[PDB]
Design a protein around this nucleic acid. Sequence first.
DNA 1: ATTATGACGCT
DNA 2: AGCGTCATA
Length: 432
Amino acid sequence: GPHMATGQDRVVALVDMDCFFVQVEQRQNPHLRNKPCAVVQYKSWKGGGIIAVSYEARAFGVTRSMWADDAKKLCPDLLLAQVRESRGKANLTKYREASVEVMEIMSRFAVIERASIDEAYVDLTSAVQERLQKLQGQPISADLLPSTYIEGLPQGPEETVQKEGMRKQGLFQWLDSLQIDNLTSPDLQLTVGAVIVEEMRAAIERETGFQCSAGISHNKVLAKLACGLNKPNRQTLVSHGSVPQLFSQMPIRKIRSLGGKLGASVIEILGIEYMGELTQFTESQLQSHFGEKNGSWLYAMCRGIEHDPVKPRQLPKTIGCSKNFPGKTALATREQVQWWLLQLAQELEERLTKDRNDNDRVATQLVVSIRVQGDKRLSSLRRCCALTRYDAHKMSHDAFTVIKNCNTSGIQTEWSPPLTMLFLCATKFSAS
DNA sequence: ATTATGACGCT
DNA sequence: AGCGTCATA
């Protein structure tokens, strides 16, 4: 009734750089632009592994986690860019620097939460308010929303044949209905957020050349969900009112954080398939199956409601260095293990120093992770030690000190079982 | 031999 | 503290 919270208190956006790694390589090498292309790392094993794919290439069925040799069978003209290799490993510096280009432009408009290298959440609530005062009850022209889609529209009543045609029909339906008289109507607020998102995205492309997609809604999960509805280079407005129809045929695994084991349990235990079917279960029922927190979250989420805040954080919380040693390449000697801990430590030191100079902070804890031959777990062991100095040899030495007793070998010089993964992460930052 | 990252929850 | 889940660069 009148006391039922509807979760329309915020305007939040999710922005995702389209095939980011690919765009970065294409900006630098015009020959790759507007072509089927992919970024790959390494080359020897089956042409190297693919980690990003242009949309031209996706139409051919090329995906990430695919071997380049195999992608070439689906798409013979596919162009490839290799990740830079340093110290015998993949180095992602070019893309991290590129990401900062984007994050710093986004920050001019609103407060952002860096989710990963290529996507961030935006809290547009206060921004929308300010804009709504300048508008002075003035209607919003469709011309201000040239790449916006309104989910669920158009509906009801011959140009409806092409994609752009449909987009505009929906947009006009949405705008014709808007009641601009009310400055507290959630739909008006979402709409103004979309205007701002258009502007943010224009600013990003003009100043970097990078294109992106975006979702606009009242919370992070709906925003994220919306972002993926119309790609590439488009944005989607998912209103609170669109939720029931949209969720009625939305597989549970499409909602963020339900794409794994918990989503599978939800589907198996409850005997449902779509997000909307969740509304038939009381909060208590949900809690009894999935715990108090997930239960409460699910109850609200299937109703389009979520309260997780956009955290004011533009910098990553950790800085890590990682390398897998698969199959026959696994590390089985001591000199081998130390040499790689040293290569990793040397990258880490280089990245931490620049981070201390750029961002006025120092990491204080070193996490060391390894994997042993046979364990299906990403990580077999995790030990942390103190990180007092940015010195590669010290960090590499301390890392060894905390793992050296994992060696089963009776011989000092050999290492068993062979290690299939080394990982050094700097964490626990402090002001400096 | 589905990388090399990143964020977060549980106990 | 050390382990596990979820997500795509």
